[PDB]
Amino acid sequence: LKAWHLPVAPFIKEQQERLMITLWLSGDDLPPRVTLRAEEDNEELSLPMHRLRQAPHPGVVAWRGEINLVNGQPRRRYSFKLLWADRQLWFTPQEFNRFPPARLEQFAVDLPDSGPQWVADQVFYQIFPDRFARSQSRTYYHHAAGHDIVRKAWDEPLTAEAGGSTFYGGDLDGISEKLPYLKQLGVTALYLNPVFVAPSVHKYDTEDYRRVDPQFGGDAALLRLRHNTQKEGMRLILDGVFNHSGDSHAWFDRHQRGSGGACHNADSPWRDWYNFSPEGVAHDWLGYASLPKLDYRSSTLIDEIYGGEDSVVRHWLKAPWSMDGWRLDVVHMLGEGGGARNNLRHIAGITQAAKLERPDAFVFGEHFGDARQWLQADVEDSAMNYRGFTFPLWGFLANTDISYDPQKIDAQTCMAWMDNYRAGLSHQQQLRMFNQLDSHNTARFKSLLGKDVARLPLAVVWLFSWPGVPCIYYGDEVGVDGNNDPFCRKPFPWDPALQDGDLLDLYKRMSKLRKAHQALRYGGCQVIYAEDNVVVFVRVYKQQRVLVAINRGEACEVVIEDSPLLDVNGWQLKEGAGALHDGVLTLPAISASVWFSR
């Protein structure tokens, strides 16, 4: 028995406050009844389906049912219950199920969708500002480090020494001046690491949430960037560091720059914004003395960060700043009493305050772990998709993982992993998952591949074609490598002699295909083949199809069975050297290929 359904047209259609749902079946012993099992205000309903008279494709039977949109919550969850006289079988995002699927692992469509619809149209670029570009027209003591900061010329090797204290002097005007490069790359949106006043180079040790650090050009340079990006039709996301402050923040003031710091004054207005021993000594947070954790048990703190009208979260989302969203640093540990108590409520409060100021604000969190409980409760829009995208590819392609432990997973396991994760997410959620290969917090993926660096182009193609929004970590596109923090923060090589121009061109081309084809931005996704070295999946949107074939190993041929999803007029190869003929994929060694239908 075979079945097909994706939570997108041609399988679903909205008409006059009804959501029409279509299922495809094929086989010799087809069920004489099918029930659409759909939820309405968390109650399970058994909606009848009826057999369509016309076969949508050869050998396929279509069943159709209807979800009433006038009642119920925006997220429409459903699965299919196949019924014979003596038995039943469920059809789900994870193929067939003999017992009922988890309620939170059904197909799901958000209708009406109140999420940030612009995200699916973006190509993001992540910039660590000190290391990207110095503007054309262009030392103090770091108390938490115990020594003055260090200045380095752009071509000086990056070392393990003075990791959080070494500045190459990149700034926000440098970004503005490189907008033509980024535009040519096909970037439409920027995610910046922290820019607010802070003593370190990474600035996760925030000293002032209301002022841009002068080292990066201060307030005027961020305003210029907001103007220049808007002018070029680009989105701009700031790093929101609300789990903790820096220990030079005036609220805390460990090195006693002034008065009323919480660290040394029991009567400080911010004393209950932090955690102290019974004797009144400030607790460190996880060995990090420089990053004291904020205590969201305090109502006055909640008001400062997100609760009030001029809270921090809302401040940078209104004029004159008008930023497009927040990436939430340490989204999973923020909470009360020194740990994650009530974490979900505080993340939801942040997101709600952001959307109050700016309805289409994009709020997404740094989740190295499993983000599904956060996303299934709608406390944020999206997550940095380490568990659903990054680590599956680190395993399948680079034989390693979050802990840099060895991994040996084949194609079957990789795609079971990736499909299981997104089964927990609505289609609209899947399309805005923040996908990337590495970050300021990981070793460079090019490094992790080691002897198999020839696989790097496969990951780039995958980055732009899996459901979700792709994010390029600055320098990835010209071949920058290096180990984990501090060595993943190399200065960008603007000398073309030091750039991998062939890799740059592949990024450019992939962004071109994504902008050109609706299925790469809105489409459903069906894995058609996954065995050993080869993954084949199709993106599906209305009548259009995008086929992707990835082969991590030696040259091979793969027979692709007849699928009603592949029943098109014909295929046009757009990228890669693969070839498709009469159901046979001829795949060169270490290759990825992309076809468009018709």
Ligand X SMILES: C[C@H]1O[C@H](O[C@H]2[C@H](O)[C@@H](O)[C@@H](O[C@@H]3[C@H](O)[C@@H](O)[C@H](O)O[C@@H]3CO)O[C@@H]2CO)[C@H](O)[C@@H](O)[C@H]1N[C@H]1C=C(CO)[C@@H](O)[C@H](O)[C@H]1O
Which residues are identified as catalytic?
Answer: 329, 366
Sequence-ordered list of residues with C-beta below 8 angstroms from that of 72, at least 6 positions apart, any chain: 39, 40, 41
Q: If binding is defined by CB under 8 A, does position 81 make contact with a second copy?
A: yes
Q: How far is the CB of 21 from ligand X (least distance, A)?
A: 21
Q: Which stretch binds ligand X (CB under 6 A): 232-240, 286-294, 351-359, 586-594?
A: 286-294
Sequence-ordered list of residues with C-beta below 8 angstroms from that of 128, at least 6 positions apart, any chain: 170, 193, 202, 440, 474, 489
Name the residue with tokens 């109140």. 114
Q: Which stretch binds a second copy (CB under 8 A): 99-107, 153-161, 266-274, 299-307?
A: 99-107
Q: If binding is defined by CB under 8 A, does position 88 make contact with a second copy?
A: yes
Q: If binding is defined by CB under 6 A, does position 167 make contact with ligand X?
A: no
575 binding partner (options ligand X, a second copy, none; Cβ < 5 to 8 Å by kind): none
Identify whether the C-beta of residue 118 lies closer than 8 Å to the C-beta of residue 436.
no
Q: How far is the CB of 286 from a second copy (least distance, A)?
A: 8
Name the residue with tokens 């009548």. 543
Sequence-ordered list of residues with C-beta below 8 angstroms from that of 214, at least 6 positions apart, any chain: 197
Amino acid at 394: W
Q: Please, what is the angle between helix 411-422 and helix 391-398, to 10°?
A: 180
Amino acid at 471: C
Q: Which stretch binds ligand X (CB under 6 A): 88-96, 135-143, 284-292, 318-326?
A: 284-292
Q: If binding is defined by CB under 8 A, does position 582 make contact with a second copy?
A: no
Helix, strand, or coil here: 53?
coil
Q: Which is nearer to ligand X, 330 or 471 (CB)?
A: 330
Figure out which of the listed residues 5, 202, 235, 446 binds ligand X, where binding follows CB under 6 A.
202
Please report, as residue ranges, which positions from 415 to 444 form the binding site for ligand X (by CB under 6 A): 441
Q: Please give the DSSP secondary-structure letter assigned to residue 396.
A: H
Task: For Cα atoms 292, 491, 363, give the angle at the middle one, nearest 5 degrees.
Answer: 50
Task: For Cα atoms 128, 237, 490, give the angle at the middle one, nearest 5 degrees.
Answer: 10
Identify whether the C-beta of residue 291 lies closer than 8 Å to the C-beta of residue 299.
no
Please report, as residue ranges, which positions from 21 to 50 form the binding site for a second copy (by CB under 8 A): 35, 39, 41-44, 46
382 binding partner (options ligand X, a second copy, none; Cβ < 5 to 8 Å by kind): none
Q: If binding is defined by CB under 8 A, does position 377 make contact with a second copy?
A: yes
Figure out which of the listed residues 99, 277, 559, 572 binds a second copy, where binding follows CB under 8 A.
99
* Greatest Cα pair distance in the chain: 81
Figure out which of the listed residues 13, 51, 103, 210 binds a second copy, where binding follows CB under 8 A.
103
Q: Which stretch binds a second copy (CB under 8 A): 48-56, 393-401, 444-452, 587-595?
A: 393-401
Q: If binding is defined by CB under 6 A, does position 40 make contact with ligand X?
A: no
In degrees rounded to 5, what are phi and psi of residue 97? -135, 135
Question: Of all helices (H) and strands (E), which one includes residue 343?
Answer: helix 343-357
Q: Which stretch binds ligand X (CB under 6 A): 53-61, 283-291, 415-423, 443-451?
A: 283-291
Figure out which of the listed residues 13, 84, 531, 542 binds a second copy, where binding follows CB under 8 A.
84
Structure tokens at 589: 């060694």
Measured CA to CA, the distance from residue 181 to residue 133 in angstroms comes to: 11
Q: How far is the CB of 322 from ligand X (least distance, A)?
A: 25
430 binding partner (options a second copy, ligand X, none; Cβ < 5 to 8 Å by kind): none
Structure tokens at 103: 């309620």
Q: How far is the CB of 391 from a second copy (least distance, A)?
A: 8
For ligand X (CB under 6 A), the number of binding residues is 15
Q: If binding is defined by CB under 6 A, does position 329 make contact with ligand X?
A: yes
204 binding partner (options a second copy, ligand X, none; Cβ < 5 to 8 Å by kind): ligand X
Q: How far is the CB of 23 from a second copy (least distance, A)?
A: 17
485 binding partner (options a second copy, ligand X, none; Cβ < 5 to 8 Å by kind): ligand X
Sequence-ordered list of residues with C-beta below 8 angstroms from that of 78, at least 6 positions apart, any chain: 21, 36, 37, 38, 39, 67, 106, 107, 108
Q: Which residues pair with 365 in a beta bridge?
A: 328, 383
Please report, as residue ranges, which positions from 475 to 504 form the binding site for ligand X (by CB under 6 A): 485-486
Other CB atoms within a 10 A radius of the CB of residue 551 amount to 26
Identify whether the C-beta of residue 254 lies closer than 8 Å to the C-beta of residue 261.
yes
Figure out which of the listed residues 131, 134, 254, 387 binds a second copy, where binding follows CB under 8 A.
387
The strand ranges marked E within 69-165 are: 75-83, 88-92, 95-97, 107-110, 124-127, 141-142, 147-148, 150-151
Q: Which residues of 87-104 are buried (b: 16+ CB within 10 A; e: fewer)?
A: eebbbbbbeebeeebeee
Q: Which is nearer to ligand X, 65 or 164 (CB)?
A: 164
Provide the binding-site residues for a second copy, judged by CB under 8 A: 35, 39, 41-44, 46, 71-73, 81, 83-88, 98-100, 102-104, 332-333, 335, 339-341, 343-344, 368-370, 372-373, 376-377, 387, 391-392, 395, 399, 401-403, 405-409, 413-414, 416-417, 420
Provide the binding-site residues for ligand X, judged by CB under 6 A: 43, 163-164, 202, 204, 288, 290-291, 329-330, 366, 368, 441, 485-486
